A paper describes a structure:
We were able to recapitulate the di-iron site from E. coli bacterioferritin, composed of four parallel helical segments, to sub-angstrom AF-RMSD using both inpainting and hallucination (the latter were not tested due to buried polar residues). The designs had diverse helix connectivities and low structural similarity to the parent (TM-score 0.55–0.71 to 1BCF_A). We chose 96 inpainted designs to test experimentally, and found that 76 had soluble expression, at least 8 had a spectroscopic shift indicative of Co2+-binding (a proxy for iron binding), and 3 (dife_inp_1–3) had CD spectra consistent with the designed fold and were stabilized by metal binding.
We describe deep learning approaches for scaffolding such functional sites without needing to pre-specify the fold or secondary structure of the scaffold. Unlike classical protein design pipelines, which treat backbone generation and sequence design as two separate problems, our methods simultaneously generate both sequence and structure, taking advantage of the ability of RosettaFold to reason over and jointly optimize both data types.
Residue numbers in the entry: 1 to 140
Write the structure that this text describes.
Amino acid sequence: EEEELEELAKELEKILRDEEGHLRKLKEALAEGLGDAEEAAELFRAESIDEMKHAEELAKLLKKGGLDPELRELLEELAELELVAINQYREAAEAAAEAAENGSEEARAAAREALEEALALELDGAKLARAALEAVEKLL
């Protein structure tokens, strides 16, 4: 029982580190304004694939048995948070792609709102991965 929790705790550690990374790169784009719209559009598309990997690992562990009821709910909440983040990453990438081709002032503000909304979802993603890793550490 201990070594299936250890591997699981290794997973939240990777997810937690990846979330803390996306946090900083997102404010960096926020600091640079739009900068190169292609920069943000290429960055969003890559990080949505990162959240892709996270939700897939969690679902495989969610199919496992013997999980503590409270631990399963935190993983279920995180997996839900990942799918909504993959959404907002796509809405922000398309708004940055429309701003790159057009120079549109509306596609600019729309890419910034979707950037800011993706940032708020990333704060709670790291917070949920922190609380989940803390619960597993208590079980160990």
